[PDB]
Design a protein around this nucleic acid. Structure first.
Lengths: 125, 171, 257
RNA sequence: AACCUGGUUGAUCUUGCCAGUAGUCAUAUGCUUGUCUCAAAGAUUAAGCCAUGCAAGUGAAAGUAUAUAUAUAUAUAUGUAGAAACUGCGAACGGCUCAUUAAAACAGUUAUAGUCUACUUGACAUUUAUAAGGAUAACUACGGAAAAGCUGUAGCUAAUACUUGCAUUAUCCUUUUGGAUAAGUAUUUGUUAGAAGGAAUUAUAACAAAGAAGUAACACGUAAAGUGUGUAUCAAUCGAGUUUCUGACCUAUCAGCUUUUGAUGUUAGGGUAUUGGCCUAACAUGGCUAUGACGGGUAACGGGGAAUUAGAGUUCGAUUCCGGAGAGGGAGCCUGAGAAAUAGCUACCACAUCUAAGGAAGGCAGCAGGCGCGUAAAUUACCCAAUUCUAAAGAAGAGAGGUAGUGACAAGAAAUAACAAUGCAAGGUUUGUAUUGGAAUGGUGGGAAUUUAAAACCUUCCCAGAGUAACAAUUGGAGGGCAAGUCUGGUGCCAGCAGCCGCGGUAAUUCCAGCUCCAAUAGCGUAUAUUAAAAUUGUUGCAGUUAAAACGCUCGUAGUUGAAUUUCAAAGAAUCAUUCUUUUUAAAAUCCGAUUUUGUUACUUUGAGUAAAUUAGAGUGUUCAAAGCAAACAGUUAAAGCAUUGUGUUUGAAUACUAUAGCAUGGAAUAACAAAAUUGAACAAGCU
RNA sequence: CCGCCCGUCGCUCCUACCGAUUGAAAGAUAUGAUGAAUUGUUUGGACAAGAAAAAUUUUUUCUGGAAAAACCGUAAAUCCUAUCUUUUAAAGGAAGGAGAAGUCGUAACAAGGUUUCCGUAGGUGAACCUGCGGAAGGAUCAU
RNA sequence: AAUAGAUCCGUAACUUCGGGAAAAGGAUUGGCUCUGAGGACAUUAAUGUUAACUCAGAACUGAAACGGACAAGGGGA
RNA sequence: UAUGUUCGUUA
């Protein structure tokens, strides 16, 4: 009867809806990356929370544990593929250090504006 | 007709769902009388046939001390360990005690041993007294309502003495 | 009424069949026959999901109508026919011969084999029983009954049956040097030399098995299929050769390309 | 993200709740709504009631054809088919719903050495024969009834329908070979002998009695003998029924229940497919219970799972899968391998249809659809193309199922512009900023490719098609909590707002409006429920002098808890300065200076066996994402690999989890229990 | 302290309670009575086919057998009785709460003008008063 | 007038806990043929002789009737 | 150590 295909939510509402110091930071980010809504930054930080949660779980596992020395390089090679980590970053300790701007710099519109093509991030969008 | 509607182990009453299934079934008893051979056919689960014997008069009966079996006829029903109403109405059941014609056995003894494998069992007096009377006591060993025939074995020795004492410190 | 169920939902189908969730509501319920539904695949998924010859059930039926495919060198035309743990499939039109084996991930794969190879069948005897006249019959994992088996044959042995005649050729025992293939466990598909046979009175007897790389894995005795003696397996094995590699370092061979 | 804030006061610190806050695969509803993907949907209350129509049928070699039609060389032979009907199989699956149900069902874990099992698969059989019998459908003629899936009489005819019924093998011996001997499959009874299982009254074998059912009086044709159908038994398989251990919410203003009426057990039997008080007869007085029996409640089908989770938890699970139960309520029964079946039958109860009034026929909690109910839920659509099932099995069916329709239930992506020049502002000729004025692009319409069972959508291509881009974004707020006005009017303790604190009597930052601003945004409010917040249910982890709260006091059973004590170190190789690995050192039974077992459990470690969906998680650019389980690789037109002239090749669909209970397993610590003296051992010799 | 504040008595509304009425209703169990339908068994016995003779007819017999009946059993359903559960009527009685502003007094908070309070008993329009024994949460940490 | 004996079952409010109570209210009952249970007495673990009517159960039987006449509470609020 | 009551509601 019911369809078997999945569906999930990719964003979480922040709770505490009127933090001035959060609203200002998030508006700074919205404007400077030219994105349409704060739901988008919510998606990005939901993603980042997922990666951070996985990494934080891995750090509790001791080194040379099979689970850690499987999923750690799985996650690490995925991160370097996304480009969030460079050659100068190599361990599980640096995935914890990723931030919203370095996640947003991989969006298509920011990349194209940086590469030229468009003279503004809004023009790129 | 089986399994449910009883009280629990503790004595508590069990709420019932799951109305009666056919595989519980529970067919009515066969009160196998003693008389002319008539049997009926019961179709059990899997189309396996069960022969429900309404009346039998003869049967295969075994002399066990010699390990032989001969076909004789049942004369009367004289005891059963369950309800006495069964013997009073002369019904054949798996452990009923019946009176059996002795002549096929005595004739077989004449023919094989002479005179009135691993032979020469020396017999006993308590059984040949019945033989001289002509009618002998036997215990049914089959289930007439299940197989459709009454078969049994002559009782001798301590079990025979037991049953004779039970039938007849006594009246 | 409550007679036998005749449908199989896709998500209820065995996992090793690999039936996609979104591709229909039902799965092909294998007909009763030589092997259990759980430890066999139907011909529909043998010729539709593995060999990709057919694109649909009707095409599988079209294949089967022409008496082309044979299982144990006899024609089979039932779409839901159990193939089995190990047995030969012959596609005559395309001349090719398969044996159903387990890969180290416990999934039924058709191993390409040669015409000369396709006359030997390894049958794991499961019951030895004597019938009237003291004639001994061996019931095998395949489900065949082989009468007048050699008295030396025991319950957990294996026999090499000749497909065309159904006669035993030689039997193999279950010593601690005999190589075996695992049938249904976590370690389904591995091939190893039997470390030992831990027998416990009244419950499942466990047997420990050494891989080629001296890795020991234990299993229930019922999940074991003697494949050869200590010299070599009596069958060609799939490309993995029945060696299960750790997930951490299978990634290394995947990455190197 | 392991979080708090407003409110008791003149002010303060508490306790403590109220209120705020966020989520909900959680329902309803208000306002609003441009794209595409994706897809829940009459469960809540009424397992209430139903008009209509559909939902299970089936013949491609293989039972039965002078209904009948046709075709080939010459009235013949082969045919090709075939309405109807008999026969066979299926209709016991599927689909729906959740009323019942509280050790019941269900789950994990066993047993069936206590049983049944159609189709399918493998083995394989025993006490007129150049082919046996009647009798029936279809059909023909005559009818009855208002009506019905009603059927009377007479006459024919077959069948794989129904019923009878026609070689032979094995053993003993002189010993390829000759004579002699013997003949029941399951099942039942009696007396015996005895490949395996953990244990046999097992397999099997012998003797003595019975003895089913069968071993083809049947149909069509493949290698340059075959298949179909049917059949005894065994086995396998698809399953089922019982069954072991362990696991469930609230309630003691339910404390004693069960036992004539079977309650607990023994013995005998009946019944069953089998075990069993399942039932009967006799007998005994048992069985459960504060570790909660027996009751009551549940707005309770159980589980896989869902929401919320830092960790513990709390709440939910009618609903994709599994198991159960039901077909208005009960009960009964036929056929059948399988049903206590309900689009099967029989009856009662309640509803309810036709009737000529005599009588007939009914069961949507199947798919649509209607009424009712309610806060609360879609089309009387298209199709068997996929998935799969039934069949006499390619070819027919299937409201199973799929496709579309309705669809702001949820979920994902994502428009409502972007850009250049001058005025103006900031500043050392840099940013913001209304005028212009050209590019870009969808939304829209039309055609096409394509898609599809057909169609639609998606995708792609060609035409027009944006300046107030009128192709015009909303919802809810602006005293505090809590982001945002001491702006302008109106009302004037009214009307009204206000979750809470409060505002409103002429300066209303709070009502009714305008402007502005804030917040989230194709979404935003409201109600109820629930989670966190709540360390305000506290095991982790609360409090009890005075905020609520130590029984008046002591004894005391259950429960919970319980002192210390029984075998301790040294030596070596390896990272950096330490750490890390190996060996022995009592005693009793095995091995001729050396070879090897030494309570029970809890507990802990490893395993085994764990359905998927969901979850975690590996891989993979669905244009991204939700997803899905796929896919990737060279080829303006071929090399390569390999095949002895062609054959694509390389892959994935992993792992983890699956209680606490059960099986196996290493174990030194910590805990119990066992053994241990008003006495109990062992050894040697003699004796039995 | 021109502070705060208690209770009776009056008025209105809301909630719940007791209540004669052998109150009412709807369910659910249990016993009893009656008891449809039906399994099984027995009794039946419309007939439907065989076997004999007479050379169209008849007797007897063997099964198979339909109505119908009986008896055990499975047992719907209705009725009576009892018990329980849920809902609900009611003269009258008697609480509580909520009213912006009632009457009467002054009980408590200051030594609250008789210190307060507890248990218990009696009494009074009301708060309350009195007896006995306690407490300090007292107005005394004290010759 | 209504039963009314006996056996088995069931029995409320209230209560001075003794009662209420035969509460209320159900069922059964003849004859016949049987089955079971209940004692006393003597012999070398064992076998005979003999007695009361009292209960319980079952078949059958009849114009469904059976404390068959006699005898014998009406109950309840 | 004779008696000496009360202060309507809201802000």
């Amino acid at each position: 009867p019911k369809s078997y295909r999945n569906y999930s939510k990719t964003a979480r509402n922040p709770k505490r809806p009127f933090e001035k110091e959060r609203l200002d930071q998030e508006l700074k980010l919205i404007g400077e990356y030219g994105l349409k809504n704060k739901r988008e930054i919510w998606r990005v930080q939901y993603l980042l929370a997922k990666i951070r949660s996985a990494a934080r779980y891995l750090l509790t596992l001791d080194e040379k544990s099979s689970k850690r020395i499987f999923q750690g390089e799985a996650l690490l090679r995925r991160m370097v593929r996304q480009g969030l980590l460079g050659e100068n970053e190599e361990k599980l300790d640096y995935v914890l250090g990723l931030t919203l701007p370095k996640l947003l710099e991989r969006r298509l519109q920011t990349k194209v504006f940086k590469l030229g093509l468009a003279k503004s991030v809004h023009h790129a969008r | 007709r089986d399994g449910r509607h009883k009280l629990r182990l503790t004595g508590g009453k069990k709420k019932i769902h799951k109305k009666k299934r056919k595989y519980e079934l529970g067919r009515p008893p066969s009160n196998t009388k003693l008389g002319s051979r008539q049997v009926h056919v019961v179709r059990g689960r899997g189309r396996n046939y069960k022969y429900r014997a309404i009346k039998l008069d003869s049967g295969s009966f075994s002399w066990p001390t010699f390990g032989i079996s001969k076909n004789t006829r049942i004369i009367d029903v004289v005891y059963n360990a369950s309800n006495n109403e069964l013997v009073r109405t002369k019904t054949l059941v798996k452990n009923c005690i019946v009176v059996i014609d002795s002549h096929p056995f005595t004739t077989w003894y004449e023919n094989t041993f002479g005179t009135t494998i691993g032979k020469s069992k020396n017999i006993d007096p308590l059984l040949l007294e019945q033989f001289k009377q002509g009618r002998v006591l036997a215990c049914i060993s089959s289930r007439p309502g299940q197989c459709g025939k009454a078969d049994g074995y002559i009782i001798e020795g301590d079990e025979l003495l037991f049953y004779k004492r039970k039938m007849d410190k006594r009246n | 009424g409550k007679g036998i169920k005749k449908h199989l939902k896709r998500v209820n189908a065995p996992s090793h069949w690999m039936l996609n969730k979104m591709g229909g509501q039902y799965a092909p319920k294998t007909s009763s026959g030589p092997h259990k539904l759980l430890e066999s695949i139907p011909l529909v998924i043998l010729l539709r999901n593995r060999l990709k010859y057919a694109l649909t059930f009707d095409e599988v039926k079209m294949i089967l109508i022409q008496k082309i495919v044979k299982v144990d060198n006899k024609v089979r035309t039932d779409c839901t026919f159990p193939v089995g743990l190990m047995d030969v499939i012959h596609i005559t039109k395309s001349n090719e011969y398969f044996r159903l084996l387990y890969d180290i991930k416990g999934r039924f794969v058709p191993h390409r084999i040669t015409n000369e190879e396709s006359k030997y069948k390894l049958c794991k005897v499961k019951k030895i029983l004597l019938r009237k006249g003291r004639l001994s019959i061996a019931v095998t994992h395949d489900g065949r009954s082989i009468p007048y088996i050699h008295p030396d044959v025991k319950v957990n042995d294996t026999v090499r049956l000749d497909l065309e005649t159904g006669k035993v050729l030689e039997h193999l025992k279950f010593q601690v040097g005999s190589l075996v293939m695992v049938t249904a466990g976590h370690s389904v598909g591995r091939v190893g030399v039997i470390s030992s046979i831990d027998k416990n009175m009244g419950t499942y007897d466990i047997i420990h098995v050494k891989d080629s790389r001296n890795k020991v894995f234990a299993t229930r005795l019922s999940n074991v299929f003697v494949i050869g003696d200590n010299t070599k397996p009596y069958i060609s094995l799939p490309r993995e050769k029945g060696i299960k590699l750790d997930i951490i370092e299978e990634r290394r061979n995947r990455l190197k390309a």
